[PDB]
Amino acid sequence: RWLNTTKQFSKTSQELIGNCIISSIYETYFGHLNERERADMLVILKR
């Protein structure tokens, strides 16, 4: 069970570096965007 958690943890580690980008972008750019515009940005970033 512990081993399964560790494998998930490694995946989580990889995922977190990628996610920090998204978080930093909302902080810097999203504050003045409308909700639909935030959605389109999120898409065009995600891609």
Add this chain to the structure above:
Amino acid sequence: IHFDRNFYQKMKVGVNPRSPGYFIDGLRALVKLVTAKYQDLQENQRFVNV
């Protein structure tokens, strides 16, 4: 860079008022987030090992 260019296309800012301000600030904030996340991750792995 690509996101910043796309953003200034979508925002409709046509000619020259597009300072690198958002670029610099988001870049600086990304150091803070990544460092904090890494420290938390190290601690959690250490805790699970313990």
